[PDB]
């Protein structure tokens, strides 16, 4: 048989003075996460799995630019920050021959996919 695609559609965003969360909808429910969490999850799998990730992720340098500062609560940046996440999940969760990407503890913990008791 073939792999099964996961239904992930992000259409929720709550801007907070501390950080901007994203309501990612899924077969389980809407999970609130941060973009900074997606990045730390990506590079991790690379060092945790030991393999190269074929997921597009454009990161911007942030040394100490005071003039080129950016607003984390900016709709312009939030708009794009929305997409790209759902896709990074479907492909990942769509394991076929190798699930090392999702087998990782970070992936299972990414959406709190632990074992409740």
From Swiss-Prot:
Signal peptide as annotated in the record: none
S-S bonds: none
Transmembrane annotation, as ranges: none
Domain of life: Eukaryota
Subcellular location(s) of the protein: Vacuole
Domain PX: residue ranges: 1-117
Note: Present with 2360 molecules/cell in log phase SD medium.
Function per UniProt: Essential for proper morphogenesis of the vacuole. May exist as structural reinforcement on the surface of the vacuolar membrane and be required for maintenance against rupture by osmotic pressure.
Subunit structure: Possibly multimeric. Associates with VAM3.
Protein name: Vacuolar morphogenesis protein 7
Organism: Saccharomyces cerevisiae (strain ATCC 204508 / S288c) (Baker's yeast)
Gene this chain is encoded by: VAM7
